[PDB]
Amino acid sequence: IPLKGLLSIILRSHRVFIGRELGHLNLTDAQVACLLRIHREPGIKQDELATFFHVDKGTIARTLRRLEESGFIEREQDPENRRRYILEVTRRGEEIIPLILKVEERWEDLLFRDFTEDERKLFRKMCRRLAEEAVRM
Template sequence: MTKENDKSDKFESMSFIALIHHISKNKLKYSIKNPNRIDMVHEGRYLIQIYKKENLSQDDLADMFCQSKGTIAKALRKLEDNGYVERKIDENNRRKYILKTTKDGEKLAILLIKDLEEWEKNVGIDRLDDDTKDQLRRIARKSEEILEE
C-alpha cells in the first residue's frame, strides 16, 4: 500500500466533523507559512470581518466567531497596537465601540482575503456548488440552535 492510499483510506474513514476540523487545521498551518501576515487563528479573521462589515462591534465579533469577549478584546488590542484597527464610541450606545480598519488595516485585510481565496482555490472549495455551500451553512446554524435548546 502506498502513502497516497494510506491518506485516502484515512480520509474515507473520518467522520464529517473530523474532516471539517482537519481542513480547518490545515488552513491555519497554511496561514502560518505566510511570512508577512498576522495570526489567522484570531486577528486575521477578525480583521477581515471588520473590513467587510460596517458598524461591527466587539460583541458582534464574539457572537460571530463563538469566542469569549476576553479573547476578542485581546486580539483587538493587538490589531490596535499594530495600527490595523481603531475603536470609536457608538453614538447610540456610549458603552459600545464600533470597529473600523485603518488604511494599513485595509491593505492587510485585502492581502488576507486574497490569501484565503488562493487557498480555497488550491483545495477546491471554490468549486463547491451553491447548494452544497447552503447546506453547510444550514448545518452550522443547526449546530448553534441545538446548543440553545
C-alpha cells in the same frame, strides 16, 4: 471521525497556512476573521462581533488588541453606551485585504489539487447549502 472533526482538520491547515503566509504582518487566522468581519460591517460594536463568533470574550479581546496594535483596526467608545466599543478597519487594514484574499485563493488551490473542477464546484455548492442551514439553526 465526526463531520466537525474533518472540517477542523481542514481548518487547521488554513490556520497554519495563514500564519506562514501572513506571519510577516503578525496575522493569524483569528485576526483575519475579525478583520474581514469588521471590513464588511464598519462600525460594528465589539460585543456584537463577539456575539457573532460565539467565542469567549477574553479570546476576542486579545485578538482585537493584536489587530489594533498592528494598526489594522481602530476602536472607539460608543457614544450611546460607555460599556460598548465601535470597530472599524483602518486604511492600512483595508489595503492588506487583497493580500489576504490572495492567500485564501492559494490555500484553496492547494487543498483542491486532486479534485476535478466539477467536484470543487459541487463541494462549494454543498457547503453553501449547509452554511444556509447553519444560519437557520
